[PDB]
Amino acid sequence: VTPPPEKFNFAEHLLQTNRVRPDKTAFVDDISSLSFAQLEAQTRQLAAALRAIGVKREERVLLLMLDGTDWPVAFLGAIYAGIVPVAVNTLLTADDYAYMLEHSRAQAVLVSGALHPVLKAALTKSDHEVQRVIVSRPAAPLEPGEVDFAEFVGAHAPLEKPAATQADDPAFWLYSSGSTGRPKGVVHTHANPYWTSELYGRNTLHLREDDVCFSAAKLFFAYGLGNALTFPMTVGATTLLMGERPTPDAVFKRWLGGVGGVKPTVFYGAPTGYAGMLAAPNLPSRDQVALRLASSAGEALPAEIGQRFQRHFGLDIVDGIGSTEMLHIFLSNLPDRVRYGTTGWPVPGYQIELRGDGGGPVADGEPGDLYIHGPSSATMYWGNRAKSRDTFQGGWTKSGDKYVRNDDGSYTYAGRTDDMLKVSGIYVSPFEIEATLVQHPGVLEAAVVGVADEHGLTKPKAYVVPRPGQTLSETELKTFIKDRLAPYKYPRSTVFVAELPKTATGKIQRFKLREGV
Numbered sequence: 001v002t003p004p005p006e007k008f009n010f011a012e013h014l015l016q017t018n019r020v021r022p023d024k025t026a027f028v029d030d031i032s033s034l035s036f037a038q039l040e041a042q043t044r045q046l047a048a049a050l051r052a053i054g055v056k057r058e059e060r061v062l063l064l065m066l067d068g069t070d071w072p073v074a075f076l077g078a079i080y081a082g083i084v085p086v087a088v089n090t091l092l093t094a095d096d097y098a099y100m101l102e103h104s105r106a107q108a109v110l111v112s113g114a115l116h117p118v119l120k121a122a123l124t125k126s127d128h129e130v131q132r133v134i135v136s137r138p139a140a141p142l143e144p145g146e147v148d149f150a151e152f153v154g155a156h157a158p159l160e161k162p163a164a165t166q167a168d169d170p171a172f173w174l175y176s177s178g179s180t181g182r183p184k185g186v187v188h189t190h191a192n193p194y195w196t197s198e199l200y201g202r203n204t205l206h207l208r209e210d211d212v213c214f215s216a217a218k219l220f221f222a223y224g225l226g227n228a229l230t231f232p233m234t235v236g237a238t239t240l241l242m243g244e245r246p247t248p249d250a251v252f253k254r255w256l257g258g259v260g261g262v263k264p265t266v267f268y269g270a271p272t273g274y275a276g277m278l279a280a281p282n283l284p285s286r287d288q289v290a291l292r293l294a295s296s297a298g299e300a301l302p303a304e305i306g307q308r309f310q311r312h313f314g315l316d317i318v319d320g321i322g323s324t325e326m327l328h329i330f331l332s333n334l335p336d337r338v339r340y341g342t343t344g345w346p347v348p349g350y351q352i353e354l355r356g357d358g359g360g361p362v363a364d365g366e367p368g369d370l371y372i373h374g375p376s377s378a379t380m381y382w383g384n385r386a387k388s389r390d391t392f393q394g395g396w397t398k399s400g401d402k403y404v405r406n407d408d409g410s411y412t413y414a415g416r417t418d419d420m421l422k423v424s425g426i427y428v429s430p431f432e433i434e435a436t437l438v439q440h441p442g443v444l445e446a447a448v449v450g451v452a453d454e455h456g457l458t459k460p461k462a463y464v465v466p467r468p469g470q471t472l473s474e475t476e477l478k479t480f481i482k483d484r485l486a487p488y489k490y491p492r493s494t495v496f497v498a499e500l501p502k503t504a505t506g507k508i509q510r511f512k513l514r515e516g517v
């Protein structure tokens, strides 16, 4: 792969690539479609609109939007203007967005109408710098000063040239969270999505122009931003976008061509979703679908899920690991070489190391902490120098995973070096769940650990000590939390216990709980 040039604007690079196919569909969702030519026009009009309201080069805008054809207009339009979109999870609380507005110093917000209520609460409570709120597909009347996305874009002539950015300039941020503390702003450059799209989208997956891409992972996840924006636009594939929560039925509807007259050829999602599909009574047959490739990431793929999928569809599931810090996948199975129970082999272009307890070498078959060296790594966590130093070794990125290298050069997942749990392939901190539980007046103490379900997928499990002299049923506790946590964070089971195993300092011995004590 040839490196990008030093003067490089990634949005211009994706528009230029598709000038050969102006009338092909670039994106289609449940109510709209853009051709490459329409996407270019709207992208450049939005770039002009952001500049016309005073947002300058290098400044941030918050992009809080459901998957749909306006999302890549917003993302690429900011980048074309050399403004930095901060693309965020759509399932967070007002308090999380308030933090993001302050931390990013976002100067504008591009928000889906269905997300406007949570955004409103974030704006009201924060010391933010937002100059304009631009609403895509409003779901209630606009407040004074707010502008509808379609009119904001339509009111401005297309910007004539992109910002003259450098390849190593910041282009966008994503946020990721650890087991405590606020979300961390992961800063990516213009070159980083070129590298992931060339080294993985093109050179590993072999995506091509005639593909129809469909990602159950949304565009704000680093996995989905590659799958359903940067990879397809790099090869001129058409992309199906879906705003609603991915369920088996919603996904099957699109597999069978129920939206936009298109059947996906490339599907993308978490192992939890593939298990949910394989359990569904109305799983389509082979002859009803056009899939040629199935990608998975976010959590380890249990071998039995890959094997059942291959037996049903005659397609393997290609499991690769990526992170928000590395932007996309750097260690993966290949479309034509899958070994289930491993994450495959290093993606050419990326170097992988396993380190022991002092940074030293680890013999094959022994676990070591995983470190990555490659060209798409983030530059830092914005405004967090300590956490940055810890993760950005020195050209090496620490992943927070342990791995074992096998005799054939493949790597087998061996768990995290922290307490985080990927449930449904999405981060869940057990300590957040514990903090929610102990605010119930009938709970005295709680401890949450990961436990493998019957499919070998990790789910949280809660051990709860009730407060003597209060009542507390399992049903009452399920109601308390349904209300306060996202569904993927719900404990699979709660066990009421008389006491928890502790050190003399009172530290809970969470390892004893995973050992089944």
Ligand SMILES: Nc1ncnc2c1ncn2[C@@H]1O[C@H](COP(=O)(O)OC(=O)c2ccccc2)[C@@H](O)[C@H]1O
Residues within 6 Å of the ligand: 176, 221, 222, 223, 224, 296, 297, 298, 299, 300, 301, 319, 320, 321, 322, 323, 324, 325, 327, 328, 329, 343, 399, 400, 401, 413, 416, 422, 425, 426, 427
């Ligand atoms: N296949 C896998 N097997 C085992 N663990 C996997 C995995 N893919 C992700 N992970 C886990 O999620 C972590 C990354 O989470 P994050 O949500 O930042 O990004 C993706 O999850 C992400 C970002 C871009 C592309 C792909 C995934 C990895 O450090 C690892 O613990």
